[PDB]
Each structure stands twice: as C-alpha cells, then as structure tokens.
Amino acid sequence: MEDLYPSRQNNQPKILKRKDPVIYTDRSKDNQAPITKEQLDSYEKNGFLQIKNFFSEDEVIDMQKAIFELQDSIKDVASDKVIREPESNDIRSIFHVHQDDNYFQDVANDKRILDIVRHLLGSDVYVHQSRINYKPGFKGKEFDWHSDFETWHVEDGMPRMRAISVSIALSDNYSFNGPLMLIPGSHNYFVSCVGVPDEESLRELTRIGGGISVPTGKAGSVTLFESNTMHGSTSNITPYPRNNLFMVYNSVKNRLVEPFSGGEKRPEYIAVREKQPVY
Ligand SMILES: [Fe+3]
Numbered sequence: 001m002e003d004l005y006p007s008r009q010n011n012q013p014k015i016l017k018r019k020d021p022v023i024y025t026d027r028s029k030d031n032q033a034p035i036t037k038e039q040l041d042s043y044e045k046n047g048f049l050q051i052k053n054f055f056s057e058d059e060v061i062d063m064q065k066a067i068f069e070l071q072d073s074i075k076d077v078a079s080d081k082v083i084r085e086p087e088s089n090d091i092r093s094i095f096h097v098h099q100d101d102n103y104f105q106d107v108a109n110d111k112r113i114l115d116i117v118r119h120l121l122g123s124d125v126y127v128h129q130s131r132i133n134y135k136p137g138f139k140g141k142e143f144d145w146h147s148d149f150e151t152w153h154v155e156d157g158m159p160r161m162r163a164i165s166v167s168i169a170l171s172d173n174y175s176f177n178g179p180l181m182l183i184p185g186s187h188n189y190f191v192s193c194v195g196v197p198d199e200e201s202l203r204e205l206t207r208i209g210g211g212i213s214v215p216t217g218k219a220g221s222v223t224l225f226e227s228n229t230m231h232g233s234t235s236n237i238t239p240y241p242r243n244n245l246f247m248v249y250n251s252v253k254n255r256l257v258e259p260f261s262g263g264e265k266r267p268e269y270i271a272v273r274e275k276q277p278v279y
Contacts, residue, residue: 001159001257001258001260003260004019004159004160005019005149005150005153005161005190005192005260006192006260007150007153007154007190007192007193007195007260008154008192008193008194008195008261009192010192010194011194012194013191013192013193013194013197013198013200013201014191014192015189015190015191015192015201015204015205016189016190016192017188017189017190018161018187018188018189018190018228019160019161020160020161020162021122022043022044022047022187022188022226023040023043023044023119023120023122024120024121024122024123024162024251025119025120025122027040032119033116033119034112034115034116034119035049035051035116035119039051043120043224043226045184045185046182046184046185046213047182047184047185047186047187047188047225047226047228047229048182048184048213048215048223048224048225048226048229049223049224049225050215050217050221050222050223050224051221051222051223051224052217052218052220052221052222053220053221054112054168054220054221054222055168055220055222056220057220059220060170060219060220063107063168063170063220063245064170064219064243066103066104067132067134067170067243067245070094070097070101070103070104070132071091071094071132071134074091074094075091080267080269081094081095081096081100081269082094082095083095090134091134092133092134092135092139092140093131093132093133093134094131094132095129095130095131095269095270096129096130096131096268096269097130097131097132097245098127098130098247099127099130104130104132104245107168107245107247108127108130108247113166113222113247113249114249116224117164117166117224117249120164120224121162121163121164121249121251122251123162123251123252123253124251124252125249125250125251125252126249126250126252126255126272126275126276127247127248127249127250127272128152128158128163128248128249128250128256128271128272129246129247129248129269129270129271129272130245130246130247130248131245131246132243132244132245132246133242133243133244133245133246134243135171135178135236135241135242135243135244136241137177137236137238137239137240137241138236138237138238138239139236139241140178140235140236140242141235142178142232142233142234142235143232143233144196144232145183145196145197145202145230145231145232146195146196146197146230146231146232147186147190147191147195147197147227147228147229147230147231148163148165148227148228148229148231148248149161149163149190149227149228150190150191150193150195150228151195152227152256152271153260154195154259154260154261155259155261155263155266155271156256156259156265156266156270156271157256157257157258157259157260157265157271158227158250158254158256159254159257160254161187161190161226161227161228162227162250162251162253162254163226163227163248163249163250163251163254164224164225164226164227164248164249165224165225165226165227165246165247165248166222166223166224166246166247166248166249167180167222167223167224167225167244167245167246168220168222168244168245168246168247169217169218169219169220169221169222169223169242169244170219170220170243170244170245171219171240171241171242171243171244172217172218172219172240173215173216173217173218173219173221173242174216174238174240175214175216176238176240177236177238177240177241177242178233178234178235178236178242179214179215179216179233179242180214180215180223180231180232180233181212181213181214181231181232181233181234182212182213182214182215182225182229182230182231183202183205183206183209183212183213183229183230183231184209184210184211184212184213185205185208185209185210186205186208186209186228186229186230187225187226187227187228187229187230189205189208189228190228191205191230197230202230205230250272255273255275256271256272256273
C-alpha cells in the first residue's frame with residue numbers, strides 16, 4: 001500500500017495534482033447514467049453536483065419526521081454514536097443510521113442515489129459513514145475548509161479518491177444560515193497539510209476555481225461532492241435551522257486499509273470496515 005497522497009508528514013504544505021479519475025465510467029457511456037451529460041460534465045468540472053427536487057414532497061416530510069422521531073426515541077441512550085451538547089445534553093448528531101435503523105437503511109439504499117454514485121465511481125459501492133446532523137437555529141459553529149479525503153486517507157486508510165459524499169438537506173438551505181460552501185474544481189488538487197489547509201493554498205484553489213460555490217434550495221435538495229472537494233461553512237447566527245442527513249459512498253474497489261498516518265483505526269461508526277455478509 002504505497003501512499004499516493006502523503007500528508008501531515010512534512011512541515012511544509014504542498015499542492016499535488018489528482019492521481020485518480022473523477023468520473024470512473026467512460027464518458028462514452030454517458031447514455032447509461034441516470035443524469036444528463038450536462039450534470040456529468042458539471043460534476044467533473046466542479047467536484048460537486050446539486051440536485052434540487054431529488055425527492056418528492058411527501059418523501060421530504062417523511063424524512064424530516066423520521067429524524068425527529070429517532071432523536072426522541074434515543075433520548076435516554078448512552079452511546080458514542082450519539083453526539084450530545086454538554087450542558088443541555090441535546091442530541092446534535094447520530095452516526096451509523098444506515099446500518100442501525102431500518103428507515104435510514106432504506107434511504108441509504110435508495111436506487112436514485114445508488115444509480116448515480118455507482119456510475120460516477122464506476123463500481124459497486126458500500127457506505128463508509130452516515131450521520132444525521134441536528135442544527136437548530138443559532139447553533140453549530142464555523143467549520144474551516146477541509147478535504148474529507150485528506151482525513152479518510154490519513155486517519156482511516158482510504159487509499160484513493162474514489163468516494164462521494166451525499167448531503168440531503170432536511171431544512172431549507174439559504175445563503176445566510178451557514179450553508180455548506182465548496183471551492184469548485186478543488187477536487188483536482190490534493191493539499192498536503194503539515195488537516196485544515198492554510199490560507200495560501202486556499203487562495204490558490206479559489207483563484208483556480210474562479211470563486212466559491214454555495215448551493216441553496218428547499219429541504220430535500222441534494223448535494224453530492226467528491227471525496228477531495230474542499231468545503232466548509234460559517235456559523236449560523238439566524239433562526240433558520242440546518243438539519244441534514246449525510247452519507248458517504250465508497251467504491252468496493254477502495255476499501256480501507258490501515259491508517260496512512262500509521263496510527264490506530266477509528267471506530268466503525270466513523271469509518272466502516274465491515275464487508276457486507278453474503279446472507
Ligand atoms: Fe467535511
């Protein structure tokens with residue numbers, strides 16, 4: 001397992017080009033994809049794709065009800081998968097719902113999602129991680145810019161950029177309430193950290209990308225983004241919440257090995273190492 005993407009090793013950051021395809025299925029096979037050529041081109045160029053109206057209105061309502069019924073059902077639970085705010089003990093995240101809850105397993109297995117990620121990753125996929133995020137109005141701090149791939153590689157042993165994050169908005173997504181922002185085109189550049197990149201690198205990626213992208217849309221809208229697309233968000237100082245369901249689809253050809261940091265494995269609810277049993 002040669003490290004094609006060393007990071008946190010050198011005390012000096014460096015930008016290296018991408019060594020992996022972005023769209024793994026041949027573009028001559030676009031006809032076979034569940035999304036158009038324009039969508040495919042836009043994913044490839046930008047490192048993300050927003051799809052508004054992915055889910056019907058009843059499905060959105062249902063998912064919104066479901067995350068709050070689950071939150072209530074687990075109020076008394078003691079579990080490292082359940083992230084709570086100290087003081088209020090309010091639940092802010094629940095990991096691994098894709099496996100631990102029937103409803104959310106079905107969402108994670110939604111054919112609409114699987115058909116896209118399988119085409120983009122040019123193989124079958126499995127869920128690397130899932131989480132429900134509860135972000136009430138006025139809650140949730142800033143998250144500095146980062147590449148998920150950098151973390152998955154160094155800390156979880158993901159060898160190659162062959163995963164896709166899928167974010168389902170379960171609250172209306174506005175410009176002003178701390179939405180997810182992304183640097184378009186940044187997926188094509190690996191920023192080796194000395195894992196939050198420095199201002200100079202971010203300036204360089206922004207310049208190349210031409211700007212900053214901020215998908216917005218009503219609850220139910222979906223944003224897919226490539227493993228190495230740089231993203232981040234401001235705090236929310238508004239009463240508009242930002243609840244979401246987040247899943248990561250990894251290619252079955254890119255299963256985790258030991259962390260490239262040389263460090264210990266993180267828990268299964270953070271990074272899946274189970275292989276699906278045949279039964
Ligand atoms: Fe992230």
